[PDB]
Amino acid sequence: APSPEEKLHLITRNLQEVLGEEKLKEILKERELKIYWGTATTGKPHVAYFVPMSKIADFLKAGCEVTILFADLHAYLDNMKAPWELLELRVSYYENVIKAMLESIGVPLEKLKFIKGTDYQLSKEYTLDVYRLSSVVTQHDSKKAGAEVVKQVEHPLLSGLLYPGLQALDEEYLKVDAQFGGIDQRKIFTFAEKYLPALGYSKRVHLMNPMVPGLTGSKIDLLDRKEDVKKKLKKAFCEPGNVENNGVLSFIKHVLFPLKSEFVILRDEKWGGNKTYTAYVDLEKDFAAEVVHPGDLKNSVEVALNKLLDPIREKFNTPALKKLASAAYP
Amino acid sequence: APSPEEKLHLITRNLQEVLGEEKLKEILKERELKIYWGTATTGKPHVAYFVPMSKIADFLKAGCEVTILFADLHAYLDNMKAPWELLELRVSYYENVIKAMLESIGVPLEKLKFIKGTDYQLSKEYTLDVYRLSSVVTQHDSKKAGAEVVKQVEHPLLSGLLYPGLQALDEEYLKVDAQFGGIDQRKIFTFAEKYLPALGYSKRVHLMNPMVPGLTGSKIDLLDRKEDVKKKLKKAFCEPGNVENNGVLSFIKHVLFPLKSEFVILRDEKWGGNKTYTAYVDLEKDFAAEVVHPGDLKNSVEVALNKLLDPIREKFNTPALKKLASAAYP
Ligand SMILES: Oc1ccc(/C=C\c2cc(O)cc(O)c2)cc1
Ligand SMILES: Oc1ccc(/C=C\c2cc(O)cc(O)c2)cc1
Numbered sequence: 001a002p003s004p005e006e007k008l009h010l011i012t013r014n015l016q017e018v019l020g021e022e023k024l025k026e027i028l029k030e031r032e033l034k035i036y037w038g039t040a041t042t043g044k045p046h047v048a049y050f051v052p053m054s055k056i057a058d059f060l061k062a063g064c065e066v067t068i069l070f071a072d073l074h075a076y077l078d079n080m081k082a083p084w085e086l087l088e089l090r091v092s093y094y095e096n097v098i099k100a101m102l103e104s105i106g107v108p109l110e111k112l113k114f115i116k117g118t119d120y121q122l123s124k125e126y127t128l129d130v131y132r133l134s135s136v137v138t139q140h141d142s143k144k145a146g147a148e149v150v151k152q153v154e155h156p157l158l159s160g161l162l163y164p165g166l167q168a169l170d171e172e173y174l175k176v177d178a179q180f181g182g183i184d185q186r187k188i189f190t191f192a193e194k195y196l197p198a199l200g201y202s203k204r205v206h207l208m209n210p211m212v213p214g215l216t217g218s219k220i221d222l223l224d225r226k227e228d229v230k231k232k233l234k235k236a237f238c239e240p241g242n243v244e245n246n247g248v249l250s251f252i253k254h255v256l257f258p259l260k261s262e263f264v265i266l267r268d269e270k271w272g273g274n275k276t277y278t279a280y281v282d283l284e285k286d287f288a289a290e291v292v293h294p295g296d297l298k299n300s301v302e303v304a305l306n307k308l309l310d311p312i313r314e315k316f317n318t319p320a321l322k323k324l325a326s327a328a329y330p
Numbered sequence: 331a332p333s334p335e336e337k338l339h340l341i342t343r344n345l346q347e348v349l350g351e352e353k354l355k356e357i358l359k360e361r362e363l364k365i366y367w368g369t370a371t372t373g374k375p376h377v378a379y380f381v382p383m384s385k386i387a388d389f390l391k392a393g394c395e396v397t398i399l400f401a402d403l404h405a406y407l408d409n410m411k412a413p414w415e416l417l418e419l420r421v422s423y424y425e426n427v428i429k430a431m432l433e434s435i436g437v438p439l440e441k442l443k444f445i446k447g448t449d450y451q452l453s454k455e456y457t458l459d460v461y462r463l464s465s466v467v468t469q470h471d472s473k474k475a476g477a478e479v480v481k482q483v484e485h486p487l488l489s490g491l492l493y494p495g496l497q498a499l500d501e502e503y504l505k506v507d508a509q510f511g512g513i514d515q516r517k518i519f520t521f522a523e524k525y526l527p528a529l530g531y532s533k534r535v536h537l538m539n540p541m542v543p544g545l546t547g548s549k550i551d552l553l554d555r556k557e558d559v560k561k562k563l564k565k566a567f568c569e570p571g572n573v574e575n576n577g578v579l580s581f582i583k584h585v586l587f588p589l590k591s592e593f594v595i596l597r598d599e600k601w602g603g604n605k606t607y608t609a610y611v612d613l614e615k616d617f618a619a620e621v622v623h624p625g626d627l628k629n630s631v632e633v634a635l636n637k638l639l640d641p642i643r644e645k646f647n648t649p650a651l652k653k654l655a656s657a658a659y660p
């Protein structure tokens with residue numbers, strides 16, 4: 001209440017791929033799943049962050065124990081002439097904004113934990129494991145693991161070969177059963193499943209979201225005012241009838257629909273009035289049939305997106321949080 | 331008493347190359363040089379270890395502060411199915427044998443220090459520096475740095491790309507002015523001179539010994555009995571008249587001659603009787619002229635080598651040290 005079958009459904013809905021279904025069902029028969037998701041604390045997050053956060057809300061509703069890793073070491077390793085002070089302010093900005101997002105969605109936070117990479121990634125046991133891994137992984141396997149996640153420059157840096165191992169070790173040191181991310185990370189994830197056992201650690205379940213087209217094609221910032229949300233959405237590409245490549249519809253599929261397993265299309269009387277959909281495939285079929293117009297779909301998103309963003313804007317309107325946003329992103 | 335000019339002469343004699351003469355002379359004008367030499371604690375050491383130890387004795391006689399690094403992390407990273415226990419016993423075997431060698435040579439140990447890599451190489455500040463370096467060094471520069479020191483296998487391991495950085499950081503963390511090793515390591519040393527400044531650390535002086543041909547061509551072990559020393563030397567290649575490629579003469583040049591800036595060739599009356607040389611070039615010239623025969627040169631080495639080894643054999647004949655040698659090398 002929820003059953004193991006209900007838990008699995010919530011945990012795995014809207015994913016592109018599940019690695020490790022067997023172990024996943026074994027766990028869910030007995031106890032709550034332990035899972036993490038990592039984000040590097042570089043770049044101001046924008047509305048597209050709702051796509052991962054929606055899965056994090058599903059994990060929490062399931063009853064999972066959920067860790068969010070703020071990967072501040074990776075952030076330092078992009079810009080070392082950026083002070084630890086600016087970096088850690090970006091860490092708090094991320095922490096506050098993630099919390100505000102999950103609060104806006106409305107999800108129990110009792111089993112949520114926040115951890116920074118530097119809390120453990122420079123400890124002696126972890127470091128030693130980094131060296132052990134390095135003496136079993138080839139440069140070739142490391143390079144191929146990082147290809148879709150580490151920016152292939154002119155002469156590549158040594159740091160890029162280390163990322164797949166550090167991310168694998170994260171699964172162990174965070175003591176999780178599973179890691180969630182994007183399908184982009186698949187090669188990092190299979191690298192972890194391959195090499196953790198060589199250090200005597202268990203392979204993890206890997207849950208992968210699809211790559212989802214952006215809402216807007218000046219991305220919508222989590223703190224943008226209503227007026228700028230409107231302006232930015234009216235600019236967004238929606239092609240009539242197009243359901244395969246539609247960032248407005250993907251936002252509904254991955255963020256708005258799962259809120260309540262409901263979505264309301266706002267439509268004038270002339271075209272039939274509002275309609276409430278209880279499965280996404282029904283919206284998709286009306287959109288493909290062109291009885292939901294792009295402008296009405298954008299509208300229905302604008303309203304629901306604004307309702308999501310309002311509590312975050314209010315929370316971040318305190319002097320303490322206003323000062324943080326200004327100092328994190330100067 | 332000794333002057334800076336005397337110190338430099340002792341420090342730098344018998345080297346193939348000095349990098350950083352300018353800073354070296356600046357230091358020696360003011361204070362004692364701080365220097366280290368590292369050895370990985372894999373493989374039982376043999377008589378060829380006298381070649382580095384002779385330079386270490388010169389540094390000590392100079393008045394230098396000398397650190398010897400026992401690189402036990404590198405040793406672990408060759409064989410991780412070798413227990414930490416066996417590894418640390420090899421560390422003590424190395425420590426005891428190095429000390430015994432330096433005692434046999436007869437050198438003040440007041441400014442000698444022994445340190446193991448694991449005393450500092452897993453600390454948080456060092457590890458962080460390893461990551462900083464990794465975000466400025468290319469894989470290409472790392473690979474080329476390690477070429478003559480890391481065994482070029484089928485698909486290379488990630489661990490081999492890390493070695494040049496860890497060795498560079500050693501210079502900083504051991505707080506030395508200089509590192510001594512073989513000319514083989516030159517690329518590692520120029521890598522350190524190039525990349526330490528990118529972490530805000532000073533470049534070091536680098537003192538490099540030549541590659542010296544082996545005494546024996548069943549190497550002579552530091553604890554081999556007299557009888558086996560004899561047997562092994564009688565087997566060694568000495569070509570009459572050959573001075574450029576002569577491991578018996580290189581042992582004299584790099585180890586025996588520097589003991590007292592003297593060497594005694596033992597020769598029958600018939601061929602002129604013994605002769606005492608006060609410069610190596612005079613021995614070399616008599617050898618090239620074939621008035622010192624290979625068999626007499628081997629003899630003179632056998633005697634002097636046995637005198638070196640006797641105190642080590644006696645020291646290692648204690649039950650405590652006999653048990654160590656057996657357990658270190660089972
Ligand atoms: O365990 C972790 C999970 C997620 C992240 C986040 C992103 C990330 C960024 C990189 O530049 C390299 C990498 O491997 C991952 C980092 C660690
Ligand atoms: O600072 C140090 C100085 C010397 C040593 C010894 C040898 C060594 C062995 C390796 O396999 C890699 C390397 O870089 C060095 C190790 C560290």
Ligand SMILES: [Cl-]
Pocket residue numbers: 210
């Ligand atoms: Cl999809």
Ligand SMILES: [Cl-]
Pocket residue numbers: 540
């Ligand atoms: Cl020489």
